[PDB]
Amino acid sequence: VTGSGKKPWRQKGTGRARSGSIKSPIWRSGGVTFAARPQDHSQKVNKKMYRGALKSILSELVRQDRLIVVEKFSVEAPKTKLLAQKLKDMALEDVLIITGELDENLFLAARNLHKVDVRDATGIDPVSLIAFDKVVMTADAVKQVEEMLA
Amino acid sequence: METIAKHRHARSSAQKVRLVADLIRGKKVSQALDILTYTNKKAAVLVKKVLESAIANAEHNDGADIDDLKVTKIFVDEGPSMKRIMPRAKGRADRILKRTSHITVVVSDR
């Protein structure tokens, strides 16, 4: 804290409490007894534990029929309107599209759709699977999952 | 009628003015006016001016016939105080409070 180490007043004779510095934490305008510092909150998770949780999550999605497997999922042109129509007739509004190969055409179509996400099998995280109401996996996307999950 | 009238930020202290206020509380305006006229206090002329204003407000903005008016309510409230530094002996300093007050007078014909 900006200031000086000079004692505000003498140790004895003054009728008020002993003080040592203007920057003491019990003083106005300067203090904070335990000041925070920039810290890393990331924690270690074992590889097997990460895989086990991912396997556990996928199984339960299948059990709650929240996971739908279909053939290749693609859009002819990079238009959000087309993607909205394709998801409308399927009665899906909050979906996570997982495809084996990432194509810019599908990536751009879903960019402006908040409730819709497009992802690759490699870039799969537990939070996304849990958060999204429905998960749609392509045939290719499914295959890569077992290979990486093993 | 209400026909209130107040004077805010009077320099006189609330305690000192409050002695004069108690004299005329509940009395008719005619008796209140000459009571203040012959009261030897600074607060007397402050309160009298407020009472004159209240009577004028009733006469102009409200019904006439100010003869039958009475001071139904009168109270003095402490106002903002000005802090001043007054040197004392041995280099010490002390705070002088210039106390103000709000004088409120309410007159009605009933």
């Binding site: 505000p8 007043w9 003498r10 004779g13 003054t14 008020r16 | 041995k90 280099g91 010490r92 300093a93």
Partner: peptide, 17 residues
């Protein structure tokens, strides 16, 4: 509000020894 910049220095009238 303001700490008196000067603190008077007293004396010991009563030794009390």
């Amino acid at each position: 509000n303001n700490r008196p910049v000067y603190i008077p220095r007293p004396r010991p009238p009563h030794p009390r020894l």
